[PDB]
Amino acid sequence: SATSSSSMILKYPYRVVDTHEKLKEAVTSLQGARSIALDIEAFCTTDQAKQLGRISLVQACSDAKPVVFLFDVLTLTPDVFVKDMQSLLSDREIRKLFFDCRRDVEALSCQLGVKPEGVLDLQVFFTAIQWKLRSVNRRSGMGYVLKSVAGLTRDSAVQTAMTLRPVWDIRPLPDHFLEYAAGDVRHILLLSNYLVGNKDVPVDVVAVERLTAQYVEHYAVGKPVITEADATPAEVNRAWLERYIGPGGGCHFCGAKGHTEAECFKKQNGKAKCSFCGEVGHTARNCFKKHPQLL
RNA sequence: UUUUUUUUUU
Ligand SMILES: [Ca+2]
Ligand SMILES: [Ca+2]
Ligand SMILES: [Zn+2]
Ligand SMILES: [Zn+2]
């Protein structure tokens, strides 16, 4: 099951790929994959610049090996790194899994001259589900998607230097920077087990692949993107959702957009209770007893 | 103690 498979994936060690010898081995491993989760860490810039800064790490985790590769592009140089990786990134027969591909794909194209093919954006997948059920086009962050899809609740000094300096320029990278960089692709690969090939997910993977391909066409143009595809960063263009996914949904009980029948305040009519602690006024997903980290 | 309760990526 996806739940037991998740525990294995979360134990995958990282491996820094920072020499030509290490790179050849990593490429050979990824060459045998069917799906490769990808992520990028880049030099932090200023708030105004939307483009990623200079690529520092490209992270990969595939179904071919229980490891997270941390490609040290800064040390290898882009020229060395892209030599054989470009063919794999361009191979439509290997699915590349992202969580918000937009900035990543822009950086791959601008900085590396590579345009991936066979891409599936799991953040978009999750949004497309919310769109079909509720006419919601919000992009949710990794933490929210992890909790809602896999029930998982997933470091500091990295966030301290980051949110508040390039950050990712220092070499050697401290262990906790490497582990920080390693985390997302583990989560991406495990999330794919829940979202992809799940008969009971109500959006077709092919539809989301096509929608993701549109994002790659928009953002992988060999130069910084002028006009964003989404009206604000934390949403998915409604017109693209209408085109690739279909009409947005709403509550079967009251007809409103934004929620489903199972969540309807009107159908619950003041009588619903938290399924964990039993009190009125909140859901199990947001219960402070079940989830004290929400206090 | 709670709302349709959310880190878009870096
Ligand atoms: Ca990312
Ligand atoms: Ca990341
Ligand atoms: Zn309703
Ligand atoms: Zn509760």
Numbering used by the authors: 42 to 195, 199 to 208, 211 to 341
Verbatim from the authors:
Compared to TbREX1, TbREX2 and TbDSS-1, TbRND is unique, as it belongs to the RNase D (RND) group within the DEDD exoribonuclease superfamily. Like E. coli RNase D (EcRND), Saccharomyces cerevisiae Rrp6 (ScRrp6), and all other RND family proteins, TbRND possesses a single 3′-5′ exoribonuclease (Exo) domain. EcRND and ScRrp6 possess an HRDC (helicase and RNase D C-terminal) domain at the C-termini whereas TbRND contains a predicted CCHC zinc-finger domain (ZFD) at its C-terminus. Depletion of TbRND results in extended gRNA tails in vivo, whereas, overexpression of TbRND leads to a substantial reduction in the total gRNA population and the subsequent inhibition of mRNA editing.
Although no crystals grew for the mixture of RNA and RND-WT, we successfully solved the structure for a complex of RNA-12U bound to the TbRND ΔZF_3–4 mutant (amino acids 41–341), a truncation in which ZF3 and ZF4 were deleted. The structure was termed ΔZF_3–4/RNA-12U and refined to high resolution (1.77 Å). Of the 12 nucleotides in RNA-12U, 10 were well-ordered and labeled R0 to R9 from the 3′ end. The Zinc fingers, ZF1 and ZF2, of TbRND mainly interact with the nucleotides at the R5–R9 region. Although RND-Exo alone does not show clear RNA1-binding affinity in vitro, the Exo domain forms extensive interactions with the RNA in the ΔZF_3–4/RNA-12U complex structure, mainly recognizing nucleotides R0-R4 located at the 3′-end of RNA-12U. The crystals of the ΔZF_3–4/RNA-12U complex were grown in the presence of 10 mM CaCl2. In the structure, two well-defined Ca2+ ions were captured in the active site in a hexacoordinated octahedral-like geometry. The A-site ion is coordinated by the side chains of the Asp80, Glu82, and Asp230 residues, as well as the OP1 atom of R0 and two water molecules. The B-site ion is coordinated by the side chain of Asp80, the OP1 atom of R0, and three water molecules. Several structures were determined, including a ΔZF_3–4/RNA-12U complex, which represents the first ternary structure composed of native RND protein, substrate RNA, and coordinating cations.
